[PDB]
Amino acid sequence: GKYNLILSEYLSFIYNSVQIPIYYSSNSELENRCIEFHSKCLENSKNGLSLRKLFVEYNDVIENATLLSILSYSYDKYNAVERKLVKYAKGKPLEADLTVNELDYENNKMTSELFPTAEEYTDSLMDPAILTSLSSNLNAVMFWLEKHENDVAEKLKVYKRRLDLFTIVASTINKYGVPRHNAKYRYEYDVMKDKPYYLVTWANSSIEMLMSVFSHDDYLIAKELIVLSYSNRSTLAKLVSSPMSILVALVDINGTFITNEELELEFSNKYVRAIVPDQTFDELNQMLDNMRKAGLVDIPKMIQDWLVDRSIEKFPLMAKIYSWSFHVGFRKQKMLDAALDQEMYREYTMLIRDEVVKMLEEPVKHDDHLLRDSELAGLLSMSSASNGESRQLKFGRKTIFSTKKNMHVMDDMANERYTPGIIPPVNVDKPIPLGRRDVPGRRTRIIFILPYEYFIAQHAVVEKMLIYAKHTREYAEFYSQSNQLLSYGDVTRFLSNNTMVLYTDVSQWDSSQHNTQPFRKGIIMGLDILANMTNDAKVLQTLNLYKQTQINLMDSYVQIPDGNVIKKIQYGAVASGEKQTKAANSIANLALIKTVLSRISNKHSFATKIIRVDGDDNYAVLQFNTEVTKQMIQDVSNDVRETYARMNAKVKALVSTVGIEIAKRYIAGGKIFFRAGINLLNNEKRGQSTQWDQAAILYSNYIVNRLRGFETDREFILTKIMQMTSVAITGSLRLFPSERVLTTNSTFKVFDSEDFIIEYGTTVDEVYIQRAFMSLSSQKSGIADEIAASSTFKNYVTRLSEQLLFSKNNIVSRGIALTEKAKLNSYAPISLEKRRAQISALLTMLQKPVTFKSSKITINDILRDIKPFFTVSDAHLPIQYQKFMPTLPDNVQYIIQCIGSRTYQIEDDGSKSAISRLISKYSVYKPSIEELYKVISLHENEIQLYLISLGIPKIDADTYVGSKIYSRDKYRILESYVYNLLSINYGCYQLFDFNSPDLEKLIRIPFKGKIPAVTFILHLYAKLEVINYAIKNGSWISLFCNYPKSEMIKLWKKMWNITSLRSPYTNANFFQE
RNA sequence: UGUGAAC
């Protein structure tokens, strides 16, 4: 509840010259008291009278009613920031060293010197792209400083380290003044031209870094990064985090977790000697020297101090620095520069071609329906993203323009223009529009915004390839339901004194022009073999079209902006945007490693314990018939680099016997680490989400970083949420949502009142609020209705439906119409209409919570029903598992030590049910977990019609609707759906082993009947409650269940009518991955 | 309608 108290202090701190607490209650008489109190406060304020008497008079309202929000009557002129800043601006401003960056525009030159005229200006290279201002961030940091001004002992030290650092931001900012943002939170030319170009982005990165500073080490790191960053905007992250790849190889392994036959983590007390050739040390030194040549001093020394003994115990610092460098900011260059960087491949091409054949051999020979109806599948899959050009479109009786892919397909079909048989060119005549990918520390890459013809021609085939990968282990990122822990387990498994790991970064090779010929040719060669495997007209054409996309790309041309011009240049490299991007890249990366390993063996003899490709990295584990020496590692390494070199591939290739480092994860000293570099006050690009969506995302970002080792003060995060979630009523009237409105599990949830613990209404007022918020979940959009009524639209929905099913439509048909009515949300005008409606509904709701016919059951209601039938009792669970993920906070880590962890993802889509499998065999349609959930619970006769309506044969439809499996699917679908509603795969929970024997003992549930659904919820509810207590208290409890038999039948009915909740908090988890 | 592909 501390959030509400914190909000008042912040408002009082921000405004000084009134606040009006607004309450509400589920009890009629109490609510009137709430209404009376609100009126009196407004009246007293409208008379400059003391509200002290009213608070005493309506003590009962303060005591029992629930705080809904807070009114903010502030008559200033959004200044204060200018006034506040000066006290902290005593230090000497920073002077940009305009000689550090290559490309001139990457140097912190005055904005004007980069864009002499307002028409040449662009924030494209520094846009924070976030719906929160620099001024607000400054206010937030200062508010925190004032609060922890009179702190003591170590808390004071944290404040002192922070006050210093913020002085640098303040001193530098004051020298030019605080950049004023516009309604869209953008920084225009007039505000910008006086100040240094990167001033605002740099401030956001520095503020984010300093508020995440605690120990002296954090302070040393933050200070170096902040100062260096102001001048260097292109190699500081790379220089700072480059020594990590060398370091993982150094640390010794003293007991680590491995993967057993049951694909689960298991402790192994083994010891593995880290063997490092002297050459590696020279390479590490050059890296350290390079950091030094760039001004770095404190960070280089820390790596150096660590290097004396290299203890996994003092490794945390190395990890901390690696996470830290990313928070310098994104490297946003100019489209042209990002674009510009871009006989022995016979073995490599053949492998790519063979791999393509294996993944589609069976689907093609059989005459897979999905391959035959590939076009239909592409249409259903189709998104609402950009197609490339902004077309003029006529809907019903309205002429509007859009770039949306969904919109383009409908307009073309309604005008005989829809022609997926013809795969448009992407050369000099029809240049590919370009998109961009910005990441911290790494160089900017370009993106192909190809026409929808390409997505349809590639969607069915890519899915078939993914399915092959799903059950192929070499493909770490696609295998089974696995998570990163299993991958961590696999590398450690075979580590011994007679084996060495070989990791390699292949991000540069994928963009290499050397790469593109063997790539497209390899896929095409594979496609021809597949074509000679069948005669099916549908299969050959879908297969043939795929061949065409590769051929068109072979020689493409790109539209690269160059100021306010769009120079068209011949791009001869494999950029990404295709449907086969990830699958193809994976196939290629794996093919490349196989090629390198094969070449090397002619010289040395080793065993291939494991080979893996995961993202932009690939690796292998080799076993030699003798003990590995420093000399052996050098010889293997030189040859591997040499093999890569002959192929003209600029890749990083290292060889060790203890660790490995890759973009997604790193394994040092037998432990697993995950970079914690998600930026907070700076985004990659601008989207269409709201401020509330953004606040939820920032919190989500904060949670992931905190789990990964990077923690930003919670109070600062809370302060940001308060600014972001507020709503202006007028110019001097601002409304701030309460903790209850923000955290309760509703459609407006932004964060959990307590980190790592998700609460669900257990009081009437909480329930009353939850029901009210849902009442106004989805808002109307005129523009969306018009187009939803247009002919071209209905025909498109009708055309899709008549191509899919055979018999009758509606559970499926109603869905297709909506799925399409939604895709119109990418369309700004529609998105804008929805937001305005949401704010007005929200403004009224905060003012005085409306009524609601309810009648809609949710997850919270099911939980609320159960709660009262459990008896708690202190219990004890000894810690028995060693730590493998060193960065986890203490409360989260403790649960793992006691109950354990898992290496998989709980099925939350229902894709593993028989009905879903049956639909898949005959239909290209893909029902969601929710649709499957409604369908399974239907009358036997109805289910048979639905399966047949989708193309499922009668002998098959009939056999299923009675069988054991159908009854079983019922339980499995609900189980999958419930896990989905409980976020058992996100945040903290995704880590915990929900089937721990130790966890199980704490749950005593006596069966008083035997009805699967009820049994499953009671055990799950108990496991979550027991775990949450452990997260919040550190000690365990035992749960006993005395749930009636009469009660269980009522509960079971309730279970099959649960409504899913949509909210910023829900969206944020989806957003993360 | 400052809007920028596969996931």
Swiss-Prot record:
Homology family: Belongs to the reoviridae RNA-directed RNA polymerase family.
An example Gene Ontology biological process: DNA-templated transcription
Pfam families assigned: RdRP_4 (PF02123), Rotavirus_VP1 (PF12289)
Described purpose of this protein according to its UniProt entry: RNA-directed RNA polymerase that is involved in both transcription and genome replication. Together with VP3 capping enzyme, forms an enzyme complex positioned near the channels situated at each of the five-fold vertices of the core. Following infection, the outermost layer of the virus is lost, leaving a double-layered particle (DLP) made up of the core and VP6 shell. VP1 then catalyzes the transcription of fully conservative plus-strand genomic RNAs that are extruded through the DLP's channels into the cytoplasm where they function as mRNAs for translation of viral proteins.
Protein name: RNA-directed RNA polymerase
Record's GO cellular component terms: virion component
Coiled coil: none
GO molecular function annotation: nucleotide binding; RNA binding; RNA-directed RNA polymerase activity
Tagged with keyword Glycoprotein: no
Domain RdRp catalytic: 486-672
Entry EC no(s): 2.7.7.48
Catalyzed chemical reaction(s): RNA(n) + a ribonucleoside 5'-triphosphate = RNA(n+1) + diphosphate
SUPFAM superfamilies, per database record: DNA/RNA polymerases
Classification via InterPro entries: DNA/RNA_pol_sf, RNA-dir_pol_4-hel_dom, RNA-dir_pol_luteovirus, RNA-dir_pol_reovirus, Rotavirus_VP1_C
